[PDB]
Protein backbone atom coordinates (compact mmCIF):
# COMPACT_ATOMS: atom_id res chain seq x y z
CA UNK A 1 0.00 0.00 0.00
CA UNK A 2 2.83 2.42 0.78
CA UNK A 3 4.41 1.78 -2.63
CA UNK A 4 1.11 2.65 -4.33
CA UNK A 5 0.88 5.90 -2.36
CA UNK A 6 4.46 6.81 -3.29
CA UNK A 7 3.78 6.21 -6.98
CA UNK A 8 0.58 8.28 -6.90
CA UNK A 9 2.54 11.03 -5.13
CA UNK A 10 5.09 10.97 -7.95
CA UNK A 11 2.17 11.13 -10.39
CA UNK A 12 0.68 14.15 -8.61
CA UNK A 13 4.09 15.85 -8.66
CA UNK A 14 4.25 15.55 -12.45
CA UNK A 15 0.70 16.93 -12.70
CA UNK A 16 1.69 19.73 -10.29
CA UNK A 17 -1.24 18.80 -8.04
CA UNK A 18 0.60 19.31 -4.77
CA UNK A 19 -2.41 19.03 -2.45
CA UNK A 20 -2.83 15.47 -3.73
CA UNK A 21 0.91 14.91 -3.39
CA UNK A 22 0.91 16.08 0.23
CA UNK A 23 -2.13 13.92 0.98
CA UNK A 24 -0.41 10.83 -0.43
CA UNK A 25 2.80 11.34 1.56
CA UNK A 26 0.85 12.20 4.70
CA UNK A 27 -0.80 8.78 4.45
CA UNK A 28 2.61 7.15 3.95
CA UNK A 29 3.97 8.94 7.01
CA UNK A 30 0.98 7.94 9.14
CA UNK A 31 1.75 4.25 8.50
CA UNK A 32 4.48 4.68 11.12
CA UNK A 33 7.47 3.22 9.28
CA UNK A 34 10.61 5.31 8.83
CA UNK A 35 10.62 7.08 5.48
CA UNK A 36 13.20 6.35 2.82
CA UNK A 37 15.24 9.23 1.44
CA UNK A 38 12.97 9.19 -1.61
CA UNK A 39 9.78 9.31 0.48
CA UNK A 40 11.35 11.93 2.75
CA UNK A 41 12.03 14.20 -0.23
CA UNK A 42 8.55 13.70 -1.70
CA UNK A 43 6.94 14.77 1.58
CA UNK A 44 9.25 17.79 1.70
CA UNK A 45 8.55 18.82 -1.90
CA UNK A 46 4.79 18.40 -1.51
CA UNK A 47 4.39 20.53 1.61
CA UNK A 48 6.85 23.17 0.39
CA UNK A 49 4.57 23.82 -2.60
CA UNK A 50 1.35 23.65 -0.57
CA UNK A 51 2.59 26.14 2.02
CA UNK A 52 4.52 28.11 -0.60
CA UNK A 53 1.30 28.98 -2.43
CA UNK A 54 -0.09 30.56 0.75
CA UNK A 55 3.18 32.38 1.50
CA UNK A 56 3.20 33.85 -2.01
CA UNK A 57 -0.45 34.88 -1.76
CA UNK A 58 0.09 36.28 1.73
CA UNK A 59 2.92 38.49 0.48
CA UNK A 60 0.86 39.82 -2.44
CA UNK A 61 -2.11 40.69 -0.24
CA UNK A 62 0.12 42.14 2.49
CA UNK A 63 1.74 44.40 -0.10
CA UNK A 64 -1.66 45.59 -1.32
CA UNK A 65 -2.72 46.14 2.30
CA UNK A 66 0.33 48.32 2.93
CA UNK A 67 -0.08 50.28 -0.32
CA UNK A 68 -3.75 51.04 0.51
CA UNK A 69 -2.92 52.98 3.67
CA UNK A 70 -5.25 55.95 3.86
CA UNK A 71 -7.82 54.05 1.78
CA UNK A 72 -9.68 52.39 4.62
CA UNK A 73 -12.31 50.85 2.33
CA UNK A 74 -9.78 48.99 0.17
CA UNK A 75 -7.43 48.32 3.09
CA UNK A 76 -10.14 46.56 5.13
CA UNK A 77 -10.78 44.29 2.13
CA UNK A 78 -7.08 43.39 1.96
CA UNK A 79 -6.72 42.90 5.72
CA UNK A 80 -9.62 40.45 5.94
CA UNK A 81 -8.42 38.46 2.93
CA UNK A 82 -4.90 38.38 4.39
CA UNK A 83 -6.34 36.90 7.58
CA UNK A 84 -8.20 34.25 5.56
CA UNK A 85 -4.92 33.25 3.89
CA UNK A 86 -3.16 33.21 7.27
CA UNK A 87 -5.70 30.71 8.61
CA UNK A 88 -5.00 28.34 5.70
CA UNK A 89 -1.27 28.86 6.22
CA UNK A 90 -1.41 27.95 9.91
CA UNK A 91 -3.45 24.80 9.26
CA UNK A 92 -0.81 23.61 6.80
CA UNK A 93 2.08 24.32 9.16
CA UNK A 94 0.33 22.69 12.12
CA UNK A 95 -0.32 19.68 9.89
CA UNK A 96 3.39 19.37 9.09
CA UNK A 97 4.50 20.01 12.66
CA UNK A 98 2.17 17.27 13.91
CA UNK A 99 3.70 14.75 11.50
CA UNK A 100 7.20 15.76 12.64
CA UNK A 101 6.43 15.36 16.35
CA UNK A 102 4.28 12.22 16.13
CA UNK A 103 6.17 10.23 13.47
CA UNK A 104 9.23 11.67 11.73
CA UNK A 105 11.43 12.93 14.59
CA UNK A 106 10.83 9.95 16.94
CA UNK A 107 11.52 7.38 14.19
CA UNK A 108 14.65 9.10 12.86
CA UNK A 109 17.42 6.59 13.60
CA UNK A 110 20.27 8.03 11.54
CA UNK A 111 21.78 11.44 12.23
CA UNK A 112 21.12 12.61 8.67
CA UNK A 113 17.39 11.97 9.10
CA UNK A 114 17.03 13.76 12.44
CA UNK A 115 18.87 16.84 11.12
CA UNK A 116 16.55 16.88 8.10
CA UNK A 117 13.40 16.68 10.24
CA UNK A 118 14.59 19.14 12.89
CA UNK A 119 15.52 21.59 10.14
CA UNK A 120 12.04 21.04 8.71
CA UNK A 121 10.54 21.70 12.15
CA UNK A 122 12.50 24.95 12.37
CA UNK A 123 11.26 25.92 8.91
CA UNK A 124 7.56 25.49 9.57
CA UNK A 125 7.71 27.29 12.91
CA UNK A 126 9.55 30.02 10.99
CA UNK A 127 6.64 30.20 8.53
CA UNK A 128 4.26 30.52 11.48
CA UNK A 129 6.48 33.29 12.86
CA UNK A 130 6.24 35.15 9.55
CA UNK A 131 2.51 35.66 10.23
CA UNK A 132 2.41 35.69 14.06
CA UNK A 133 0.79 38.35 16.23
CA UNK A 134 3.07 39.55 18.98
CA UNK A 135 1.96 37.55 22.02
CA UNK A 136 1.92 34.09 20.44
CA UNK A 137 4.93 35.10 18.33
CA UNK A 138 7.48 34.74 21.14
CA UNK A 139 6.63 31.09 21.75
CA UNK A 140 6.57 30.35 18.02
CA UNK A 141 9.97 32.00 17.54
CA UNK A 142 11.44 30.01 20.44
CA UNK A 143 10.15 26.73 18.99
CA UNK A 144 11.78 27.56 15.65
CA UNK A 145 15.14 28.48 17.18
CA UNK A 146 15.20 25.41 19.43
CA UNK A 147 14.59 23.10 16.47
CA UNK A 148 17.23 24.81 14.33
CA UNK A 149 19.72 24.71 17.21
CA UNK A 150 19.36 20.99 17.93
CA UNK A 151 19.71 20.25 14.22
CA UNK A 152 22.76 22.52 14.13
CA UNK A 153 24.45 20.68 17.00
CA UNK A 154 23.77 17.20 15.58
CA UNK A 155 24.96 18.09 12.07
CA UNK A 156 28.12 19.76 13.37
CA UNK A 157 29.04 16.47 15.05
CA UNK A 158 27.93 13.89 12.48
CA UNK A 159 28.35 15.53 9.05
CA UNK A 160 31.01 17.00 6.81
CA UNK A 161 30.73 20.78 6.23
CA UNK A 162 29.98 20.07 2.55
CA UNK A 163 26.95 17.86 3.22
CA UNK A 164 23.89 19.41 1.50
CA UNK A 165 21.67 19.00 4.57
CA UNK A 166 24.25 20.70 6.79
CA UNK A 167 24.67 23.52 4.28
CA UNK A 168 20.92 23.85 3.72
CA UNK A 169 20.43 24.02 7.49
CA UNK A 170 22.94 26.88 7.75
CA UNK A 171 21.17 28.67 4.89
CA UNK A 172 17.78 28.58 6.62
CA UNK A 173 19.07 29.14 10.17
CA UNK A 174 20.88 32.26 8.93
CA UNK A 175 17.72 33.50 7.21
CA UNK A 176 15.91 32.87 10.50
CA UNK A 177 18.32 35.20 12.30
CA UNK A 178 18.10 37.88 9.60
CA UNK A 179 14.33 37.83 9.10
CA UNK A 180 12.78 36.61 12.37
CA UNK A 181 15.23 37.86 15.03
CA UNK A 182 16.26 40.91 12.94
CA UNK A 183 19.92 40.09 13.62
CA UNK A 184 21.85 40.58 10.36
CA UNK A 185 25.25 40.38 12.09
CA UNK A 186 24.45 36.96 13.54
CA UNK A 187 22.90 35.93 10.22
CA UNK A 188 25.97 36.91 8.19
CA UNK A 189 28.32 35.26 10.69
CA UNK A 190 26.39 31.99 10.44
CA UNK A 191 26.33 32.06 6.63
CA UNK A 192 29.99 33.06 6.27
CA UNK A 193 31.20 30.38 8.69
CA UNK A 194 29.28 27.65 6.86
CA UNK A 195 30.53 28.84 3.47
CA UNK A 196 34.13 29.14 4.69
CA UNK A 197 34.08 25.73 6.37
CA UNK A 198 32.81 24.12 3.15
CA UNK A 199 35.38 25.92 0.99
CA UNK A 200 38.09 24.63 3.32
CA UNK A 201 37.11 20.95 3.00
CA UNK A 202 36.08 20.78 -0.66
CA UNK A 203 37.93 17.45 -0.88
CA UNK A 204 35.13 15.95 1.26
CA UNK A 205 32.44 16.27 -1.44
CA UNK A 206 30.91 13.10 -2.90
CA UNK A 207 29.86 12.35 -6.47
CA UNK A 208 26.32 11.59 -5.29
CA UNK A 209 25.66 15.20 -4.20
CA UNK A 210 28.45 17.59 -5.19
CA UNK A 211 26.03 19.52 -7.42
CA UNK A 212 23.63 20.06 -4.52
CA UNK A 213 26.39 21.13 -2.13
CA UNK A 214 27.78 23.67 -4.59
CA UNK A 215 24.32 25.13 -5.30
CA UNK A 216 23.66 25.71 -1.60
CA UNK A 217 27.11 27.23 -1.18
CA UNK A 218 26.20 29.67 -3.96
CA UNK A 219 22.92 30.48 -2.20
CA UNK A 220 24.82 31.15 1.03
CA UNK A 221 27.16 33.62 -0.70
CA UNK A 222 24.23 35.21 -2.55
CA UNK A 223 22.54 36.02 0.76
CA UNK A 224 25.82 37.47 2.05
CA UNK A 225 26.17 39.63 -1.07
CA UNK A 226 22.56 40.76 -0.61
CA UNK A 227 22.87 41.47 3.11
CA UNK A 228 26.28 43.20 3.07
CA UNK A 229 25.72 45.11 -0.18
CA UNK A 230 28.84 43.74 -1.86
CA UNK A 231 29.61 43.78 -5.57
CA UNK A 232 28.09 45.88 -8.33
CA UNK A 233 31.15 46.38 -10.56
CA UNK A 234 32.74 43.83 -12.87
CA UNK A 235 35.78 42.08 -11.42
CA UNK A 236 39.18 41.67 -13.03
CA UNK A 237 41.79 39.04 -12.16
CA UNK A 238 43.70 39.90 -8.99
CA UNK A 239 45.53 37.95 -6.27
CA UNK A 240 44.00 36.84 -2.98
CA UNK B 1 -22.71 43.68 -1.78
CA UNK B 2 -21.92 43.02 -5.45
CA UNK B 3 -19.25 45.73 -5.44
CA UNK B 4 -17.57 44.07 -2.44
CA UNK B 5 -17.57 40.71 -4.23
CA UNK B 6 -16.06 42.28 -7.36
CA UNK B 7 -13.28 43.91 -5.34
CA UNK B 8 -12.49 40.66 -3.50
CA UNK B 9 -12.43 38.90 -6.88
CA UNK B 10 -9.89 41.44 -8.13
CA UNK B 11 -7.93 40.81 -4.92
CA UNK B 12 -7.97 37.04 -5.47
CA UNK B 13 -6.82 37.57 -9.06
CA UNK B 14 -3.73 39.44 -7.86
CA UNK B 15 -3.04 36.68 -5.34
CA UNK B 16 -3.57 34.10 -8.12
CA UNK B 17 -6.17 32.34 -5.95
CA UNK B 18 -8.56 31.56 -8.78
CA UNK B 19 -10.89 29.24 -6.84
CA UNK B 20 -11.68 32.21 -4.60
CA UNK B 21 -12.00 34.44 -7.66
CA UNK B 22 -14.48 32.06 -9.30
CA UNK B 23 -16.45 31.77 -6.06
CA UNK B 24 -16.74 35.56 -5.80
CA UNK B 25 -17.95 36.02 -9.37
CA UNK B 26 -20.31 33.06 -9.08
CA UNK B 27 -21.99 34.86 -6.17
CA UNK B 28 -22.18 38.06 -8.24
CA UNK B 29 -23.76 36.16 -11.12
CA UNK B 30 -26.30 34.47 -8.84
CA UNK B 31 -27.61 37.89 -7.77
CA UNK B 32 -29.44 37.90 -11.11
CA UNK B 33 -28.43 41.31 -12.46
CA UNK B 34 -26.75 41.57 -15.85
CA UNK B 35 -22.98 41.65 -15.52
CA UNK B 36 -20.92 44.64 -16.57
CA UNK B 37 -18.11 44.11 -19.05
CA UNK B 38 -15.69 44.23 -16.12
CA UNK B 39 -17.62 41.62 -14.13
CA UNK B 40 -18.08 39.54 -17.28
CA UNK B 41 -14.32 39.43 -17.84
CA UNK B 42 -13.56 38.60 -14.20
CA UNK B 43 -15.91 35.61 -14.33
CA UNK B 44 -14.29 34.50 -17.59
CA UNK B 45 -10.73 34.86 -16.27
CA UNK B 46 -11.53 33.06 -13.02
CA UNK B 47 -13.11 29.97 -14.55
CA UNK B 48 -10.53 29.78 -17.35
CA UNK B 49 -7.80 29.35 -14.73
CA UNK B 50 -9.83 26.96 -12.57
CA UNK B 51 -10.66 24.67 -15.49
CA UNK B 52 -7.27 25.29 -17.10
CA UNK B 53 -5.48 23.72 -14.14
CA UNK B 54 -7.46 20.51 -14.63
CA UNK B 55 -6.93 20.54 -18.41
CA UNK B 56 -3.18 20.90 -17.91
CA UNK B 57 -3.10 18.13 -15.31
CA UNK B 58 -5.31 15.92 -17.47
CA UNK B 59 -2.90 16.26 -20.40
CA UNK B 60 0.14 15.41 -18.26
CA UNK B 61 -1.48 12.31 -16.80
CA UNK B 62 -2.91 11.24 -20.17
CA UNK B 63 0.58 11.48 -21.66
CA UNK B 64 2.01 9.32 -18.86
CA UNK B 65 -0.86 6.86 -19.35
CA UNK B 66 -0.06 6.56 -23.05
CA UNK B 67 3.70 6.23 -22.48
CA UNK B 68 3.15 3.42 -19.93
CA UNK B 69 1.52 1.08 -22.45
CA UNK B 70 2.75 -2.43 -21.77
CA UNK B 71 3.36 -1.48 -18.12
CA UNK B 72 -0.05 -2.39 -16.76
CA UNK B 73 0.92 -1.65 -13.14
CA UNK B 74 1.96 1.95 -13.84
CA UNK B 75 -0.72 2.46 -16.50
CA UNK B 76 -3.55 1.52 -14.11
CA UNK B 77 -2.22 4.12 -11.66
CA UNK B 78 -2.29 6.79 -14.39
CA UNK B 79 -5.72 5.78 -15.70
CA UNK B 80 -7.38 6.01 -12.28
CA UNK B 81 -5.77 9.37 -11.51
CA UNK B 82 -6.82 10.66 -14.94
CA UNK B 83 -10.41 9.69 -14.12
CA UNK B 84 -10.18 11.54 -10.79
CA UNK B 85 -9.06 14.68 -12.64
CA UNK B 86 -11.84 14.22 -15.20
CA UNK B 87 -14.46 14.22 -12.43
CA UNK B 88 -13.16 17.55 -11.12
CA UNK B 89 -13.08 18.89 -14.67
CA UNK B 90 -16.71 17.97 -15.36
CA UNK B 91 -17.93 19.52 -12.10
CA UNK B 92 -16.28 22.81 -13.07
CA UNK B 93 -17.72 22.80 -16.58
CA UNK B 94 -21.21 21.88 -15.36
CA UNK B 95 -20.91 24.72 -12.85
CA UNK B 96 -20.14 27.21 -15.62
CA UNK B 97 -22.78 25.82 -17.98
CA UNK B 98 -25.42 26.15 -15.26
CA UNK B 99 -24.58 29.82 -14.75
CA UNK B 100 -24.79 30.41 -18.50
CA UNK B 101 -28.21 28.77 -18.87
CA UNK B 102 -29.80 30.09 -15.67
CA UNK B 103 -28.44 33.67 -15.60
CA UNK B 104 -26.01 34.90 -18.24
CA UNK B 105 -27.64 33.92 -21.56
CA UNK B 106 -31.23 34.85 -20.56
CA UNK B 107 -30.19 38.27 -19.20
CA UNK B 108 -27.94 39.17 -22.16
CA UNK B 109 -29.69 42.17 -23.71
CA UNK B 110 -27.00 43.44 -26.08
CA UNK B 111 -25.71 41.38 -29.00
CA UNK B 112 -22.12 41.65 -27.78
CA UNK B 113 -23.07 40.01 -24.48
CA UNK B 114 -25.00 37.10 -25.99
CA UNK B 115 -22.15 36.31 -28.40
CA UNK B 116 -19.71 36.32 -25.47
CA UNK B 117 -21.85 33.95 -23.40
CA UNK B 118 -22.76 31.63 -26.28
CA UNK B 119 -19.07 31.42 -27.21
CA UNK B 120 -18.38 30.62 -23.56
CA UNK B 121 -21.07 27.92 -23.66
CA UNK B 122 -19.43 26.42 -26.74
CA UNK B 123 -16.06 26.49 -24.99
CA UNK B 124 -17.10 24.61 -21.87
CA UNK B 125 -18.99 21.95 -23.81
CA UNK B 126 -15.81 21.67 -25.89
CA UNK B 127 -13.82 21.05 -22.70
CA UNK B 128 -16.32 18.34 -21.75
CA UNK B 129 -15.91 16.86 -25.23
CA UNK B 130 -12.14 16.72 -24.74
CA UNK B 131 -12.71 14.12 -22.00
CA UNK B 132 -15.96 12.46 -23.15
CA UNK B 133 -16.53 8.72 -23.57
CA UNK B 134 -18.10 7.88 -26.89
CA UNK B 135 -21.81 7.53 -26.09
CA UNK B 136 -22.26 10.74 -24.12
CA UNK B 137 -19.73 12.43 -26.42
CA UNK B 138 -22.14 12.86 -29.34
CA UNK B 139 -24.61 14.90 -27.30
CA UNK B 140 -21.83 16.97 -25.75
CA UNK B 141 -20.34 17.70 -29.17
CA UNK B 142 -23.74 18.75 -30.53
CA UNK B 143 -24.29 21.13 -27.61
CA UNK B 144 -20.91 22.74 -28.27
CA UNK B 145 -21.51 23.16 -32.00
CA UNK B 146 -25.02 24.55 -31.50
CA UNK B 147 -23.74 27.19 -29.07
CA UNK B 148 -20.85 28.17 -31.35
CA UNK B 149 -23.19 28.35 -34.34
CA UNK B 150 -25.76 30.63 -32.72
CA UNK B 151 -22.96 32.91 -31.52
CA UNK B 152 -21.51 32.84 -35.04
CA UNK B 153 -24.79 33.90 -36.63
CA UNK B 154 -25.43 36.74 -34.16
CA UNK B 155 -21.90 38.14 -34.41
CA UNK B 156 -21.93 38.00 -38.22
CA UNK B 157 -25.01 40.24 -38.17
CA UNK B 158 -24.24 42.66 -35.33
CA UNK B 159 -20.43 43.07 -35.27
CA UNK B 160 -17.59 44.28 -37.43
CA UNK B 161 -15.14 41.56 -38.57
CA UNK B 162 -12.43 43.22 -36.45
CA UNK B 163 -14.35 43.03 -33.17
CA UNK B 164 -12.29 40.99 -30.66
CA UNK B 165 -15.26 38.87 -29.58
CA UNK B 166 -16.10 38.02 -33.20
CA UNK B 167 -12.47 37.17 -33.92
CA UNK B 168 -12.07 35.21 -30.69
CA UNK B 169 -15.22 33.27 -31.55
CA UNK B 170 -13.79 32.32 -34.95
CA UNK B 171 -10.54 31.26 -33.28
CA UNK B 172 -12.29 28.84 -30.91
CA UNK B 173 -14.93 27.62 -33.37
CA UNK B 174 -12.14 26.74 -35.81
CA UNK B 175 -10.24 24.89 -33.08
CA UNK B 176 -13.49 23.06 -32.33
CA UNK B 177 -13.65 21.83 -35.93
CA UNK B 178 -9.98 20.83 -35.99
CA UNK B 179 -9.82 19.11 -32.60
CA UNK B 180 -13.34 17.86 -31.83
CA UNK B 181 -14.80 17.10 -35.28
CA UNK B 182 -11.36 16.22 -36.75
CA UNK B 183 -12.12 18.45 -39.75
CA UNK B 184 -8.96 20.45 -40.54
CA UNK B 185 -10.31 21.64 -43.91
CA UNK B 186 -13.38 23.19 -42.28
CA UNK B 187 -11.19 24.52 -39.47
CA UNK B 188 -8.74 26.23 -41.84
CA UNK B 189 -11.58 27.64 -43.95
CA UNK B 190 -13.19 29.19 -40.87
CA UNK B 191 -9.91 30.68 -39.63
CA UNK B 192 -8.84 31.99 -43.05
CA UNK B 193 -12.22 33.62 -43.75
CA UNK B 194 -12.21 35.41 -40.39
CA UNK B 195 -8.62 36.58 -40.86
CA UNK B 196 -9.25 37.72 -44.44
CA UNK B 197 -12.46 39.55 -43.53
CA UNK B 198 -10.65 41.42 -40.74
CA UNK B 199 -7.69 42.31 -42.98
CA UNK B 200 -10.17 43.72 -45.50
CA UNK B 201 -11.88 46.09 -43.04
CA UNK B 202 -8.92 47.20 -40.92
CA UNK B 203 -10.34 50.74 -41.05
CA UNK B 204 -13.12 49.52 -38.72
CA UNK B 205 -10.85 49.00 -35.70
CA UNK B 206 -11.35 51.17 -32.62
CA UNK B 207 -8.77 52.67 -30.26
CA UNK B 208 -10.41 50.90 -27.31
CA UNK B 209 -9.50 47.42 -28.59
CA UNK B 210 -7.23 47.49 -31.64
CA UNK B 211 -4.49 45.73 -29.67
CA UNK B 212 -6.84 42.87 -28.78
CA UNK B 213 -8.14 42.51 -32.34
CA UNK B 214 -4.63 42.36 -33.79
CA UNK B 215 -3.49 39.77 -31.22
CA UNK B 216 -6.39 37.45 -32.08
CA UNK B 217 -5.72 37.94 -35.80
CA UNK B 218 -2.15 36.79 -35.13
CA UNK B 219 -3.45 33.75 -33.25
CA UNK B 220 -5.72 32.90 -36.18
CA UNK B 221 -2.81 32.99 -38.63
CA UNK B 222 -0.60 31.05 -36.21
CA UNK B 223 -3.11 28.19 -36.17
CA UNK B 224 -3.24 28.27 -39.97
CA UNK B 225 0.56 28.14 -40.17
CA UNK B 226 0.53 25.23 -37.71
CA UNK B 227 -2.26 23.32 -39.46
CA UNK B 228 -1.09 23.81 -43.07
CA UNK B 229 2.63 23.45 -42.35
CA UNK B 230 3.55 26.79 -43.90
CA UNK B 231 6.79 28.70 -43.38
CA UNK B 232 10.12 27.49 -42.07
CA UNK B 233 12.49 29.63 -44.17
CA UNK B 234 13.24 33.32 -43.72
CA UNK B 235 11.30 35.60 -46.06
CA UNK B 236 12.69 38.35 -48.26
CA UNK B 237 10.75 41.30 -49.68
CA UNK B 238 8.63 40.35 -52.67
CA UNK B 239 5.42 41.62 -54.29
CA UNK B 240 1.94 40.29 -53.58
Q: CATH number, domain at A97?
A: 1.20.190.20
Set of chain B residues whose Cβ sits within 8 Å of the Cβ of A87? none
To test the contact with chain A by mutation, choose from B6, B9, B13, B15 the residue with the greatest count of A C-beta atoms within 10 A, namely: B15
A35-41, long-range: CB within 8 Å, 24+ apart, which pairs?
A35/A104, A38/A6, A39/A6, A40/A113, A40/A116
Buried b (16+ CB within 10 A) or exposed e, B16-28: ebbebbbbbbbbb
**Nearest by Cα to A166 from A102, A158, B13:** A158
Q: How many residue contacts between A and B have a Cβ separation below 8 Å? A: 50
Q: Is residue B234 in a domain?
A: no
Q: Is residue A237 in a domain?
A: no
Q: Quote the longest CA-to-CA distance of chain B.
A: 60
Set of chain B residues whose Cβ sits within 8 Å of the Cβ of A79? none
B149-157, long-range: CB within 8 Å, 24+ apart, which pairs?
B150/B118, B151/B114, B151/B115, B151/B118, B151/B119, B151/B121, B151/B122, B154/B111, B154/B114, B154/B115, B154/B118, B155/B111, B155/B115, B157/B111
Rounded to a whole number of angstroms, the distance from the CA of A77 to the nearest CA of chain B is 7
Out of A15, A17, A57, the one facing B17 most closely (by C-beta) is A57
Set of chain B residues whose Cβ sits within 8 Å of the Cβ of A61? 11, 14-15
> d(Cα A133, Cα A139) in Å, to the nearest integer?
11
Q: Is some CB atom of chain A closer than 8 A to the CB atom of B15? A: yes
CA A43, A45, A48: angle at the middle one, nearest 5? 105
Out of B57, B74, B81, the one facing A16 most closely (by C-beta) is B57
Q: Is residue A239 in a domain?
A: no
Q: Is residue B48 in a domain?
A: yes
Q: Is residue A179 in a domain?
A: yes
Contact A107, A34 (CB under 8 A): yes
Contact A171, A213 (CB under 8 A): no
Q: Is some CB atom of chain B closer than 8 A to the CB atom of A60? A: yes
Contact between chains at A81 and B15 (C-beta distance less than 8 A): yes
The number of distinct structural domains making up chain B is: 1
Contact A34, A113 (CB under 8 A): yes
Q: What is the resolution of the experimental data for this entry, in Å? A: 2.4
Structure determination technique employed: X-ray
Taken as a whole, chain B contains a residue count of 240
CA B27 to chain CA centroid, Å, is 22
Q: Is some CB atom of chain A closer than 8 A to the CB atom of B81? A: yes
Set of chain B residues whose Cβ sits within 8 Å of the Cβ of A11? 61, 64, 77-78, 81
Q: Is residue A236 in a domain?
A: no
To test the contact with chain B by mutation, choose from A50, A81, A84 the residue with the greatest count of B C-beta atoms within 10 A, namely: A81
Contact between chains at B61 and A4 (C-beta distance less than 8 A): no
User: Domain span at residue B27?
Assistant: 1-228
CA B100 to chain CA centroid, Å, is 14
Q: Which helix (H) or strand (E) holds A47?
A: helix A37-67
Q: Is residue A238 in a domain?
A: no
Residues of chain A by 3-state class (helix, strand, coil), percent to 5: 80, 0, 20
Out of A8, A11, A61, the one facing B15 most closely (by C-beta) is A61
Contact between chains at B64 and A11 (C-beta distance less than 8 A): yes
Amino acid sequence: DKNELVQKAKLAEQAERYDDMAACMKSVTEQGAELSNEERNLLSVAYKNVVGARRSAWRVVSSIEQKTEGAEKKQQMAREYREKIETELRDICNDVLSLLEKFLIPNASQAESKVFYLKMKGDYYRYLAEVAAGDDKKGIVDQSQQAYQEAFEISAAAMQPTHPIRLGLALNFSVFYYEILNSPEKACSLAKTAFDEAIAELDTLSEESYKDSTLIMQLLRDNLTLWTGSGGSRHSSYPA
